[PDB]
Symmetry: D2
Subunit: 295 residues, 4 copies
């Protein structure tokens, strides 16, 4: 049988294949940070040749952030499948066993390769870029809200009907010998939104700022002004607190005039992930925007 | 016919750009020109231009102006229709839902496409909004949002999509009724207290307590919360991850802010589902408030009003458990 | 503690590829020791079958049981198959004269499976059946942490444990650890209906015909040939019908048969022909209501008023 | 500009199309889409196949059965040029009639080459949808058409399409289905399952000797006992029987509660009843064997 290594990183999930298990760290994913991300990726890139595929048990809270980061830093072309649980393992009707079950299936399937980093939840294979946590409590919380799942799992078989075109081998981000990430913060937009948050990050000389805008990534006037001065003086990506849909160019915001970057379908967390890595290679908004159109 | 007062605030309903191209500005078209875009209203007898702005610049002053209109002119009309930007309609609609002391159907409506666009959605939406406002069965339902042929309540309505004309959805509890042929089959009503049942009286308020929102994500910086605390904000909402949790940095500063009096509400960046008590965070232990089903923008609204009557974390927790 | 009586009909929840309705009611209770902390659970095995074989006789039995024993218990939970629960639940919603909570629950995964969903479903069903806030909402279905109304709950997905959704108007409340009730159904239900099945041992014959391109009209004609009392059309779009099928139902309606227009399109109302528009009711739910109406009238005009209920 | 042929089945009104393409109109038929049928399909496919010349096609169609025509054309059109279907949920007389911008975007999609080699497409309310998974979800909503199982191929903004997906099942040029030489399609009907379901509708189709029957089963393609009894005898008389589901989302899978291979049934996978009918009709043009039909249903 193929050999699949389970990498455990935390999450309620604790709190066909020849399966080996290693625990890298054990944290709530709400405390997820650059160091675990750099450690997790360096682990998988180092042990790529040593196994047939990886399954990663993780907290569901920032699962979408980790999955996107690995989707952009994993150079291992072998399947990397992320998995978690919404109910505790000791609790009744614990969902984790069959989730992890399905993840090993996904990681064992030879058809799964070259689909990037995947997330497997509730009988479904989700792509790392579009997966998001939809609901605070549901076991079916994970969804690709914009483009949808890649496949469904039944009786150990996967009917793959999609593959993402936007990852893994094909990305230029190499964090192998990197021990820090650029600083990227996220500011929320709302009625009468305060600029205090964005002013705080700019004054700290943050490399980047993501805007959790309203609608098509729009900003409150105070915020927009301040981010306009920062971008023109800090990288600023426009994303949206809106859970679904692209933050587009050519709507109500001339980004060129302002040197903003429209985040596309990337939500504020995922936009942050991509902005962080883009700032390891360039700081020009005109250049970054090209990165955001391909990843 | 019923008398419906249309209060205009701006919005992509009142915005223009060419019909093809997608660049456009909002809070352009004056109300009077929107009335004319919908010849088929003489349903009701159409009005006032309060502001003409993109709803992304919506703020307490416009909120307070809106509430003061509706309550003072309640007896002079049969119901109101508020033309608004889609971006914060869920916020405005919730504030009015907590502050309007009238019964008249207060129905908010917007458009995802500019009025100059091809197949602009605003004319027929505004039609159904008037329809909604004119049907008195809409009375006693709180502040409503009528979008894409659907009637939604101000508490649960939220913007699901950045571009879809079907963008608005009551994701957690669902719509109140659907509109066909100028007729509404209402099958629900919201259970939380709204409008006339709220303990909030804005008649003598010209400004709201200061409440900001901090976002949560991996490795999150705590400088925004430290900035809001240092700024003496009355309330802070965290758009937490999952069931309202915080990154260690952010939880640290808010732990200290809450202990020295700041209202701290735990909500979720997660668009649907409740941020509940007794999960991973013991709210009674750090004097916090779980926001329940209220998303962060809506949680801000409730904490702002709550801070007009009380600064007790036990007391706020029930305001959030009741509205 | 409250007395909750569990009425079992089968389902995957009681099943063990897999077979439905193998396990008995005491074993669905056994499997969750925690129910001892919440209610005094008693059980009755009404039938033990896959809900794809659910039928009128079982419907009539359930309604009479719930109606007769309403004064013997504090609330009922019905363990049931997920395939037709949306029908049974809506049937009970209109025929139960009991005001006490009547809660339906099921499983998408067998009792034998990894991550079997029935235990926590059945627990949450008993909680709901025990909560005083649940009474007077009509018949409820509790699946995957949520209280759903019998009228609007429908099965949205073929395999998901979260399949059940009130797709048009949404859930009534959410269950965590004790229910956040924020909605209540406005159409009339339970003790508020004009339908009395107590002394009925058969129901009027109602069938369903599907519409699609090139649709054959032989299925509609077969139901016409059988003198079926009612025909629901699973139409396309907003209750539209293929030409040949529309012709046959025109003849069926003209010779006395009730014809309700519904839609195969899973969401939204089929709107208001001397036909009956089903409104938001999908074909199977439209079927149950049309069945009941034909116990009180066969007037299409009065039948449409029933559907506006 | 590319030459786009708009084939109408049910203009000067949108002048902004002419900013994107050189329109040819042509009235293939004049029908309500609830009356869509095999003959319009055979004509549509043969028309497109012969005129494949042009740079792309746009097909204006009623929304009610568009998902059937889209899938049928998805499997029988041999042209690799973009074939885009579009309709309106609101009449053109309405206040906010959606047809103009839909038609606009359909021409945009059809004129874009990135659209080629994605099969037959459906463009409705700002979205590029694949012919296989696209389905009509809501009775009146303008946002009704959506790919519920696997999702949209791209979104249209400002007359530009961000394609991020393509369907993996074989379509168009990779299919063995050639309707060019057919003047009729095999007779395949659909029966619904519900509690107490009557077997009279399915027996009517067996009595008329239909080649194929699709079951809109409950749950994972299950059948009421009466209907199963009937479909079993039909399979026993060489009839093809495909198990689908009235449930709008998810696959009707093998290895659940019905031993397909024992009875000779085919699980439809994610194909819903009307779509399963389209493929079974074409499947019956090449074979009448359940292993081969089931394979075909895992292939398309
Ligand atoms: N920025 C606009 C967007 C819209 O109206 O759709 C607003 O909310 O005012
Ligand atoms: N009675 C249903 C139970 C389920 O599927 O959950 C069935 O037989 O399929």
């Amino acid at each position: 049988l193929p050999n699949i290594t389970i990498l455990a990183t935390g999450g309620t999930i604790a709190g066909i294949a020849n399966v080996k298990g290693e625990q890298v760290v054990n944290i709530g994913s709400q405390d997820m940070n650059d160091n675990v991300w750099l450690t997790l990726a360096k682990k998988i890139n180092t042990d790529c040749d040593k196994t047939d595929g990886f399954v990663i048990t993780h907290g569901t809270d920032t699962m979408e952030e980790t999955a996107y980061f690995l989707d952009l830093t994993v150079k291992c072309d072998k399947p990397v499948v992320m998995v978690g649980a919404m109910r505790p393992s000791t609790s009744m009707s614990a969902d984790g066993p069959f989730n992890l079950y399905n993840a090993v299936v996904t990681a064992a399937d030879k058809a799964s390769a070259n689909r990037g980093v995947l997330v497997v939840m509730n009988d479904t294979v989700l792509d790392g870029r579009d997966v998001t946590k939809t609901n605070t409590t549901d076991v079916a919380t994970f969804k690709s809200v914009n483009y949808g799942p890649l496949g469904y799992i039944h009786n150990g078989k996967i009917d793959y009907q999609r593959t993402p075109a936007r990852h893994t081998s094909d990305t230029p981000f190499d964090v192998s010998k990197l021990n820090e990430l650029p600083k990227v913060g996220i500011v929320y937009n709302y009625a009468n939104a305060s600029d205090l948050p964005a002013k705080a990050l700019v004054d700290a000389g943050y490399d980047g700022i993501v805007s959790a805008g309203v609608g098509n990534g729009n900003l409150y006037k105070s915020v927009f002004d301040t981010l306009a001065t920062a971008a023109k003086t800090t990288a600023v990506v426009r994303s949206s607190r809106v859970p679904t849909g692209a933050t587009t160019q050519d709507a109500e915001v001339d980004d060129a005039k302002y040197g903003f970057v429209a985040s596309g379908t990337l939500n504020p967390q995922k936009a942050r992930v991509l902005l962080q890595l883009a700032l390891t290679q360039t700081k020009d908004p005109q250049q970054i925007q090209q990165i955001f159109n391909q990843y």
